[PDB]
Every structure is written in C-alpha cells, then in structure tokens.
C-alpha cells in the first residue's frame, strides 16, 4: 500500500451528501495532472494537501 500525496482544487458544493462528509476535487501531487474527486470527512478547504490510500475508488453518493 504505497502512500500517494494529493491536493485540493474545488470543494463540490451542491453534491455532498450523508452528513459532514465533504466531497472534494483532487489534483494529484507527484504527477500534477491526474485529478479524481474524493470523499473527505472533516473540515477541508481549497489548497489543502490530503493523504489518500489506494486510488482505485470511483464512487460517490
């Protein structure tokens, strides 16, 4: 399980569902192009470096 650092561009306003879970737009940090959207618990803003595990997650609510 290699660790992939990652950061944030957009905060996805009207989508985020089921409680305080913020869904967020994510631009990868080592290769600064590949951008997936991830599910984030807790307070998160733009320009905020997130640490994610295995990136084979394409799901939402």
């Amino acid at each position: 399980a290699p660790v992939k650092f990652v950061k944030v561009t957009r905060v996805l306003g009207r989508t985020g569902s089921r409680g305080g879970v913020t869904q967020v737009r994510v631009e990868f940090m080592d290769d600064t192009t590949r951008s997936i959207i991830r599910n984030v618990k807790g307070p998160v803003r733009e320009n905020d470096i997130l640490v994610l595990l295995e990136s084979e997650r394409e799901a939402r609510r």
Partner: protein, 155 residues
C-alpha cells in the same frame, strides 16, 4: 442526483451509439436481418436519438446548478460528454448550450485534456462541428441583419 442523471443518461446514450455503430457496420456488410434491439427507455419516448435524449435531460437541469451537476462529472465520463457535444455541434442542437457547457468542461479540465491525446482527436472533431455550426448560424444572422437594414432603409 442531477450529475447522476447526466452520468447514467450519458452512459445509456453511449451504449445506444455502440448499438447503432455495430448495426451500422452490419448494414455496411449486408441488408440482412440485423435487429438493433434498442433500450426500453428510448422506445418509451419513441425511437428517439441519443442527441435529443441527452439534450433534453441536459435541459431538465436548471442553469443555476448546471455547473454543479456538470462540475461533479468525473474524468471517466468526460469523453462521452465530448462525444455528445460532437453530435450536438454536428446536427446543431442548442449551440449556446453546447458552447456554454463545453467551455465549462474544458475550462476546468485543461491539464487533463491538454495532457491527454485521444480527446484532442475528438476535440478536433468537436472543434470542426462547433466552428462550422457557429460560423453558419452567424453568417445567416448577419445576412438577416443586413437585409432588415436594406428594407428598413428602403421604406
């Protein structure tokens, strides 16, 4: 749920284009019996094209939250959206809409689009259909404003 609406409608239109390109290859082979067997959500609206299905379900979303449902779109289903904007710019189905939401999608996703390669080929296609569409309609309306000038000066 609106981004899920254009996600699943985008996927149903994508498999619809898959079935009519398989059937289109088969009718380029022979006029033999080749059942297209379309989707029982398309046949309930009446054997409609995916252009007017996906266009009408992009006109259901009210254009405040158009960029919200449009902005939740993942990079997996950006290319099928570019396919249908190639079709909307081809047969000219509401070109201020396909301009507007095209420019939202590229305007966000530049570095993935400019770093990719295949969507610069389909981006060349939608460049051709978009430029020909806006070019033609622009030329028509310019001719009409000139003609209305000549008649209104003629009186």
């Amino acid at each position: 749920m609106a981004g899920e609406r254009i996600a699943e409608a985008l996927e149903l239109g994508m498999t619809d284009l898959n079935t009519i390109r398989e059937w289109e290859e088969a009718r380029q082979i022979n006029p033999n019996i080749a059942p297209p067997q379309r989707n029982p959500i398309f046949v309930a609206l009446g054997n409609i094209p995916a252009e007017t299905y996906v266009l009408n379900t992009l006109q259901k979303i009210k254009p405040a939250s158009l960029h919200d449902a449009l902005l939740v779109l993942p990079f997996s289903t950006i290319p099928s959206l570019l396919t249908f904007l190639n079709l909307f710019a081809q047969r000219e189905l509401n070109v201020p809409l396909t301009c507007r939401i095209l420019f939202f999608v590229l305007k966000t996703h530049h570095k993935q689009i400019v770093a990719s390669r295949t969507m610069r080929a389909t981006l060349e296609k939608v460049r051709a259909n978009l430029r020909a569409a806006l070019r033609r309609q622009k030329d028509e309306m310019g001719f009409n404003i000139a003609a209305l000038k000549v008649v209104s000066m003629q009186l």
